Amino acid sequence: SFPKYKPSRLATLPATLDPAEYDISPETRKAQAERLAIRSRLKREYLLQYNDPNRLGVIEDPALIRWTYARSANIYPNFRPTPKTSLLGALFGIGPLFFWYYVFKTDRDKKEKLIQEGKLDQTFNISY
Amino acid sequence: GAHLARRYLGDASKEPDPLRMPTFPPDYGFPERKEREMVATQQEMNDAQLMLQQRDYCAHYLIQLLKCKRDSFPNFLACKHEQHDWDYCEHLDYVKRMKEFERERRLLQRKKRREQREAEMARG
Amino acid sequence: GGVHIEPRYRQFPQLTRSQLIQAEFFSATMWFWILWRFWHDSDAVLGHFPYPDPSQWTDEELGILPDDED
Amino acid sequence: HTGQEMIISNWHWMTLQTVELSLSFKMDYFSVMFIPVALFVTWSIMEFSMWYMHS
Amino acid sequence: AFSAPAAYLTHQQKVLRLYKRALRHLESWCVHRDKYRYFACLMRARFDEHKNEKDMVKATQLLRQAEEEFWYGQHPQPYIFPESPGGTSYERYECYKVPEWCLDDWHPSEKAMYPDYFAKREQWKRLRRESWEREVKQLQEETPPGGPRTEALPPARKEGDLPPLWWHIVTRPRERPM
Amino acid sequence: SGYTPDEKLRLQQLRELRRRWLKDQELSPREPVLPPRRVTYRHSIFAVTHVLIPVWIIHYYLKYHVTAKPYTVVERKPRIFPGDTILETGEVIPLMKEFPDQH
Amino acid sequence: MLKIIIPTTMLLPMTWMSKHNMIWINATVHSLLISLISLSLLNQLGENSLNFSLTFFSDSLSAPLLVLTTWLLPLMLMASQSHLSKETTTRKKLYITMLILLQLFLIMTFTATELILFYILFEATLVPTLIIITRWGNQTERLNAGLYFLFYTLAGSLPLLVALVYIQNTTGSLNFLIIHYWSHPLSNSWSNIFMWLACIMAFMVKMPLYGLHLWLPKAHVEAPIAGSMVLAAVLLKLGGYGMMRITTILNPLTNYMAYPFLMLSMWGMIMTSSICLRQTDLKSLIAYSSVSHMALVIVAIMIQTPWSFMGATALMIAHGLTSSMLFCLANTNYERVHSRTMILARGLQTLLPLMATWWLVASLTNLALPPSINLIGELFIITASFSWSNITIILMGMNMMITALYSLYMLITTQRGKYTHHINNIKPSFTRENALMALHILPLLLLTLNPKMILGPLY
Amino acid sequence: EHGHSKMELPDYKQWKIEGTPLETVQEKLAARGLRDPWGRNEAWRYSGGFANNVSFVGALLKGFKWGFAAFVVAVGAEYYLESQ
Amino acid sequence: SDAPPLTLEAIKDRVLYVLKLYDKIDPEKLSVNSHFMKDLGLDSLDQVEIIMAMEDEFGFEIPDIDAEKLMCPQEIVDYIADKKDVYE
Ligand SMILES: CCCCCCCCCCCCCCCCC[C@@H](O)O[C@H](CO[C@H](O)CCCCCCCCCCCCCCC)COP(=O)(O)OCC[N+](C)(C)C
Ligand SMILES: CCCCCCCC/C=C\CCCCCCCC(=O)O[C@H](COC(=O)CCCCCCC/C=C/CCCCCCCC)COP(=O)(O)OCCN
């Protein structure tokens, strides 16, 4: 026995410590085989397009286009106003503004009161 | 260290506070109280423009050493006697500071002993 | 701009006498310098001015009275 | 030899009202002592790199 | 790198991979050669004491406790060969690798230098042009229906044929181009 | 374990092609066909063109343009010790107070 | 001022009567000559202004903007020469006509001495830009983009017109000289608050202010290269110039009406900068960086101090040049790759080294490396903000760090690493592209030698 | 000018485990019924010019003898010149 | 750098040199084409150790998927040559 490793979000579990790789079933082997099959099909398509002498252009990747489209333009049509989104939007978009307003307003009120009472010592403060 | 152990592990009031030292009148021990003598005047000490921290009671030896250093330039080990003289004067200054520390400590000892004897006489 | 030295394959590499003598000379120079400086300036290590004993000073020079006057 | 110290404000860059920005060099003890050391080390490093980065 | 991967690793491959990893990390712990030799012989003796075991279940129970023990004592700073994926010179020369097709964009005053090289290059280009038309059909008929099952490629089987999809493997830039 | 026969054969064919390609990367003795067309000594010229000319330009610029304006080159005041004499005036700074010297 | 206006007008018949194969040459040569002529406006006084006539006047705030406007036209022509090769002669002449009309409208807008005249030309600049975006744009989103660019603008500027005529019925004049000399304080009142909002919002929406900036990424990513150049370099600065001009009649209301916008800017510059950290489009990243810089300019104008105004002027000029250069670099990649996605074309330093040097210099300038005039403007604004409140440094400091990050990010993703294997159509850089980058970058480093030219009228 | 001199390998029969710490490793292994099959592959690390070692203190005192002799000569000359 | 341009003969000589110092195999029996399991009667662990000795000898690492199918000295030499771009 040895002290156990505890995985986290930013330090994931090693593959050699996965119990899932020791629970081997025929269905698991079939899933692995068909995953390799689809990877092989994609690799064959890419390599046929890549080794072609005739082609003189960037090869188009549908996966990259889908990624960029999902990140940019598919956002709003799938947006739904929910309590979670409404609350997070209100917080993240309004709270910082009022926090900084309070901080700066308090600071400037303090400075203005000090100036009016004359106890600030602004000697040599010529450029503003 | 031993004074740190004495003050921090033993009785704090038994030992001087370096920041607030001295706490007793200079004439408390003996009434002679000869004054310290300074050799370098304000003007020449300003003309030599030593530093505000080198402007101490050993400044004349520093001025002489600087004169040697400037005068015999290429031979940078020519004037070592005056370096020794300045170092000796600084040594004597440090010894005087140590004597001040010791005197304050012994006066504190004696004052606390007076307080204990007076308290014993009052309780008896 | 050096000379040709072939690899050796599991044997000690070929050495020039020049680098050996230069390295020995510079090590000897460092040790001679240390010995010379210690011989001439020993106070830089062991000190020159003795440290006085604070408890060995008599009460006369410290302005201490025999616990009865003031 | 002496303790020579200098300020050289040679080129006037601009003036924002009461603030004058000019190209000024401080040739004090720190500058005149650090420049030779940096140049010596740089000369050694360049000679070393002539051999180290030959390929 | 060169060999196509399979769908899964068998038990034997996993055991051998553990053996190699453990020996490498033991070498990283034992800097000196004689100490490493002694402890590596000890590790070999520890490794083959269950070499002859028959049942799969406990043989898989072993190599799990072995992985846990390895991960506990894995020397967080193991030795890496400088060109290996973690080494100090892994992708050092990646910036000096230029594709061959860039030579097609050289100025004629540049190609005027090195005429023999560019004549040989034209020979290579025409060879590629014929071989590609042969290779496409060869791969088309050699593939099972439904698509490839493994990303392994066949050799050439005729006389004047070339291995399908050979151009970008044969014309690699170099290991140290500049 | 080991290679399948097809893998072995493909490897031999690929490595023969690669060795041919690598051999074709060498240069002939005449390959860099260079077209020619035009239109202590070294240390001396280096010291003349890289030290003397810049120092001349900089000294001229400092002596006749920079110092033409006030406070452009400000010097730290030289140190004065007792017993020194001044070139400009010629008076002698008095000595110190003859401190008691011993050790 | 007509010595610049009349040749710009004569550009149109010269374009239309030109030969079919000589439009670009003639347009470029005569635009460069007009820029050389407009260089003479830089001789300004410490006194009032260069009041040429009752209609036009020039200032040390207007002169650098005019010089930038006249200099941008030849660069736009060079950038547009490439992708307009297969276009009919009449449509190429129409494109050049749109560019010339935009330059004419901008020239007049900067020098107009009347607020109403300024409003009319400030709106007239919209039509050529809208036509350029929606006609010669590439993707299908351009139409939507154009709509945004229009209505946002109009939604801000229709109230301003109302306010303007109202002011002229109260003071009796909209001439800027009279308005400055006869200024009166604004009392704290609801009517005065709404007049302030009407006078401010039209210029806020075109900076753009954070939260009102949604039109800018659409317009800049959907426009052709010349449209992006003119939008980022000149059209954004119209709001800054307008706010600098109009704040003279808004005091002392600005002392407390500026709080909502200042916050919206000081926080906003953070958000947009962070947005640049996660972006998959080059043009979108450059547009968001423009939003951050303009937020800093908004803060500078709202602070209303001499150092603030100097920094705002310098930053406006510097950002114009830098953003135009960055858009040109992105377009020179796009015309080879046709994707506009950052991670497609990679390791381009190996294939195009001099273009990589141009990329490095542009990234360094956007990063505000001293002594560039970008850093001069940024530092003057930061010092003024620190005097306004010592806490601001925090936000300002954060922005600085973030900016460097994303700038170098854009430099590392596209130029470093390994080249993409299947992209084999990356041809050597043309002399036209290299000359375009050189003509962008040399004026910046030249201007760092005489910063007083771009420090505005408060120098 | 590069190193093409046709370097020839030494004889593999030369490397022997005797007289090395690998011999002690082999003895310890045989105390448990094991053997080291790769022992002769490392023998060259203890065979030729690599057979002799230097201590840390010996490494620090690399040039102490010549420096000490020079120091003795110099101090003697200093004594014989000052005393004049 | 200053690294001599190793050749196929050098690679073969060094591979055979390392193999002859493996006391598990008889130096008379082995050749360039002598198989590991069948010709010399070795195990899989022995093959892993041989690959590790090759890696230590030549200063670079062979990935496990490639290393597991190198069953003759000749294929070891071929792998090293293909990796290091050896002409002759
Ligand atoms: C969306 C993306 C951003 C777009 C741009 C946003 C910027 C616009 C923000 C508008 C600036 C503030 C407007 C008014 C500021 C005046 C100060 C006043 O509101 O505060 C208190 C006023 O108290 C309350 O605010 C009274 C008004 C309450 C009703 C107003 C609605 C509050 C939130 C509405 C926000 C909606 C904005 C978007 C509209 C579509 C002061 O108390 P009081 O001393 O008595 O009044 C002083 C003014 N006097 C002298 C004229 C009398
Ligand atoms: C990007 C979208 C932005 C849309 C524009 C936002 C700015 C809106 C500014 C207010 C709109 C109307 C401005 C009025 C024009 C100025 C003229 C003026 O100030 O005169 C005032 C009149 O002021 C008004 O009447 C204004 C009333 C408001 C009516 C219109 C409401 C529009 C929406 C108001 C809330 C939104 C404002 C801020 C929006 C923030 C951005 C979304 C005094 O009238 P008198 O009666 O003659 O004098 C009083 C003494 N007898």
Ligand SMILES: *OP(=O)(O)OCC(C)(C)[C@@H](O)C(=O)NCCC(=O)NCCSC(=O)CCCCCCCCCCC
């Ligand atoms: O003939 P080959 O093809 O070479 O087959 C080799 C072998 C038969 C041994 C093997 O491939 C196999 O198939 N074995 C069958 C049973 C089996 O192997 N069961 C698992 C045994 S696990 C084991 O060996 C114990 C591991 C002990 C070492 C732990 C490592 C910890 C190191 C920590 C870092 C220094």
